[model samples]
Target chain A: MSTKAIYPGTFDPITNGHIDIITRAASMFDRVILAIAASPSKKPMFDLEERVALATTALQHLPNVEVMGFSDLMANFARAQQANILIRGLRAVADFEYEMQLAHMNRHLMPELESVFLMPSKEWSFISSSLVKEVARHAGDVTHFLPANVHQALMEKLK
Target chain B: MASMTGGQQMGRGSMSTKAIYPGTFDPITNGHIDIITRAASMFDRVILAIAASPSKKPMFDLEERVALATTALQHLPNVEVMGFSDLMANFARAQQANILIRGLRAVADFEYEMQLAHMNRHLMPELESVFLMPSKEWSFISSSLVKEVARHAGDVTHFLPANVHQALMEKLK
Candidate 1:
């Protein structure tokens, strides 16, 4: 009966990968929370507000999707949001042991919130926030992998 | 009778389907066990078929490989272990297995798996090749990786079954 899902991300500046996943999660789940984590330790190029705002516009057409930012432990935020499902988009998860360990710990912390892993579209497979930001920093036109506004924002952030 | 949902349809479809999971399986890791567990649930019976790849020159011989897998998978009711030197498709045909199972560890190896699947499909059209994803915990560990660590005296107790780990330790010694 519970179809509400939280799609957590550090969406430094949400790329098409985030958009595609948010879109897919919105289609499957009754309600999808595009929860942006405020990971200050990584010193993100875009603040949480900017991430929420960017992702908000990127996935504006999805009616069941909501954009928000959080700093608490992900499991805590998931419980606070009253979400019974956790939607995670996988790319290089084998390389990111954190996602593996976190998914297990999150299950222990909140037993009812089931974790669902969604595969990335082959088109977006090679794209990531850090990878995009690095290329965009070197003055590359990587707009094909990003929404127009996010690309424009990246340009501004670089200059 | 009521119309069944998609999930229900799959549950019924899997009812009596036998699958063969063929691999070199020199020493089956937790990853193989994860795939086998899922296969056991979905199929009426699963054959963890170990291949004797004379070219690969596996550290564990065919009989020892089957013994290790049998020991590792002792608790699975519908799962059985065997060693085969013939082609996988022919082995499955002999057993009347309806499905051939493989694990998808990463996207990097997806093309290779697909090539293998296509070759198997060509060899036996009726035998379906299914690719399964193992648990994230086991995703990072493969028999090759575990063997590499064990060779270097690295801790791999978390990646293999207890008996398999002990056997591997003894083999390395």
Candidate 2:
């Protein structure tokens, strides 16, 4: 049987860390969907459409991976996509408590969808979208943390 | 293995770089090991300095944490485990360390780490702060989380070393 997984994140600009997790997920599951949340509450630098576009372009190499945006609850999105697994990236102790609570809540909301955690490669483990944005905002070198396409767009946006 | 060449190879001239990784290490989880292992590879010597953060009131005392870390990092010849109560910069200077190793996990930890790094830099301008990322297997585990899970009778064997796991179980019991 083919197993599908959904990886939901704000992915403001889709850093190497997000790509690391998505690439790993794509390898394990038959199909992996990168779900970009319409998280306006966090005042994301990129809108949902832009985020999805960047993710789509960055992950074009993966044949079975799809990039899309969603505004509903994560579990609801997972159900709509017919995904059996919900993938989340765990980074450190700070992320553990929040993730445990999120996983439990997601489990409660949709018992059928299993929450799975993936860790990024050591190279990308210390990076996050906000950090990339902050560095770029201050004219720092963030080319190492983002894809060529995303890095170009970010530079243009910051300018 | 390839045969060695008889050319006059370059010899070491400058002082060896020593780095100090300071933390409370309440119990010293696998995450700490991951960072220190990488740090050891980059520097001539890496010192695992356990801070006696009395204000935070860690689960393991200074000596216990130091003992656990020493045992856990025994494989690394250049890694030294020591305990201290002085300021981190002061301890680093005392150890003749010019580098301060910090581990970064996520966005949530970025601000706090940046603040600490800046503060350390202020205290010792000669000591440079470098951040290392942990391996994927250990990126999610922390000492506090391990203790919390063990306290609630959850399986934390995967997060800690065998010795630490045994010690934690005995302590909890």
On DockQ, the leading prediction is 1
Candidate 1's C-alpha runs over 4 A off are A93-96, B1-173
What candidate 2 keeps of the native contacts, as a fraction, is: 0.00
Off by over 4 Å in 2: A1-159, B1-15
Worst 10 residues of 2 chain A by lDDT: A113-122
Q: What are the iRMS values of all candidates?
A: 10.0, 16.4
For each of the candidates, what fraction of the native contacts does it recover? 0.00, 0.00
Clashes of each: 0, 0
Residue B124, model 2: lDDT of 83
Complex DockQ per candidate: 0.05, 0.03
TM-score of each: 0.53, 0.50
